[PDB]
Paper text:
BC-producing bacteria have a cellulose synthase operon in their genome. [name] consists of about 20–30 residues of signal peptides, followed by about 750–900 residues of periplasmic domain of tetratrico peptide repeat ([name]-TPR), and about 380 residues of the outer membrane domain of the β-barrel ([name]-C). Thus, the TPR domain is believed to be important for exporting polysaccharides.
In this report, we determined the crystal structure of the N-terminal six TPR motifs in [name] ([name]-TPR(N6), Asp24–Arg272) from Enterobacter CJF-002. The crystal structure of [name]-TPR (Asp24–Arg272) was determined at a resolution of 3.27 Å. There were five molecules in the asymmetric unit and the Matthew’s coefficient was calculated to be 3.9 Å3 Da−1 with a solvent content of 68.5%26. [name]-TPR(Asp24–Arg272) is a helical structure formed by 14 α-helices (α1–α14). We found a non-TPR α-helix was inserted in the middle of TPR motifs in this structure. A comparison of five monomers in the asymmetric unit showed that they can be classified into three different conformations: chains A and C were type 1 (root mean square deviation (r.m.s.d.) was 0.74 Å for 243 Cα atoms), chains B and D were type 2 (r.m.s.d. was 0.38 Å for 204 Cα atoms), and chain E was type 3. The conformations of these three types were different at the turn region between α5 and α6. The C-terminal two helices (α12–α13) were not included for this calculation since this region was not built for chain E. These results indicate that [name]-TPR(N6) consists of two structural domains, an N-terminal TPR domain (α1–α5), and a C-terminal TPR domain (α6–α11), connected by a hinge at Thr107–Ala111. Thus, α5 seems to interfere with the formation of the super-helix between TPR2 and TPR3 through the interaction with TPR2. Based on the superposition of types 1 and 3, the C-terminal super-helix changes its screw axis by a conformational change at the loop of Ser109–Gly110. Collectively, the inserted non-TPR region can be considered to play two important roles: covering the interaction region of the upstream TPR motif to separate from the downstream TPR motif, and changing the direction of the downstream super-helix at the loop.
Residue numbers in the entry: 26 to 268
Write the structure that this text describes.
């Protein structure tokens, strides 16, 4: 990976862990390396917003507006700026209200009204693109956005889970297998990754390819309890060949 990418990723880590040391450091080197990068400008934009300096924030916003007006970074920053205070804040409060009470189409409608297709960075983007993924039509572009969030903020069990199941739901098994292996190198979700990689084996008829799929599952997962059942039924499956 580049150094900019590592610095920006450290910015996101610092943002996530409420440590503005890291944010400060990474920003400090970033604005010397690539001062006009909309991702860097957006990073400072968010920082200035956290410190309640809406003036400096706004200046950075304008800088982005004259530098990259149709970048995801700019419009996402615009959204965070809308939610920075007052009306937008409560719009969100209402969207999440209908989101939690189970008014899903209403909730999606409100979120569409606020984020207008570019949610503010962080977990809200995950929530939004997951909610949007619930719509059959919009599902595929939303899947694309989710894959992006997976590449930008790695290590999210829940996101990887939803992404894997979505990709299965659209017959994109290779990619879903990939997300399952990514969920397999990290401890948080192995049982889940195994669980999904073992409800795809149940849906294929006992066959040679069934067997090879199950043994491949056996090279990806070592232990667990789906693994034990995988071995048991693997033996049974390959014994069932030749009567």
């Amino acid at each position: 990976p580049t150094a900019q990418q590592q610095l920006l990723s450290q910015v996101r880590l610092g943002e996530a862990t409420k440590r503005e040391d890291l944010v400060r450091q990474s920003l400090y080197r970033l604005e010397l390396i690539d001062p006009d990068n909309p991702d860097v400008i957006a990073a400072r934009f968010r920082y200035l917003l956290r410190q309640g300096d809406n003036a400096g924030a706004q200046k950075q916003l304008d800088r982005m507006k004259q530098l990259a007006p149709d970048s995801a970074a700019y419009k996402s920053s615009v959204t965070s700026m809308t939610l920075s205070g007052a009306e937008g804040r409560q719009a969100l409060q209402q969207a999440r209200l209908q989101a939690t009470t189970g008014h899903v189409p209403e909730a999606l409608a409100a979120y569409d009204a606020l984020f207008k297709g570019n949610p503010p960075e962080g977990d809200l983007a995950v929530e939004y693109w997951a909610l949007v993924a619930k719509v059959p039509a919009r599902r595929s572009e939303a899947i694309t956005q989710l894959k992006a969030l997976n590449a930008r903020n790695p290590g999210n069990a829940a996101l990887q889970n939803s992404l894997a199941q979505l990709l299965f739901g659209e017959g994109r098994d290779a990619e879903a297998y990939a997300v399952l292996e990514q969920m397999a190198k990290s401890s948080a979700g192995r049982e889940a990754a195994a669980g999904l990689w073992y409800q795809q084996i149940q849906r294929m008829p006992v066959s040679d390819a069934s067997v090879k799929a199950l043994q491949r599952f056996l090279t990806v997962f070592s232990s667990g309890d789906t693994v034990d059942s995988a071995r048991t039924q693997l033996a049974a499956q390959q014994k069932q060949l030749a009567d």
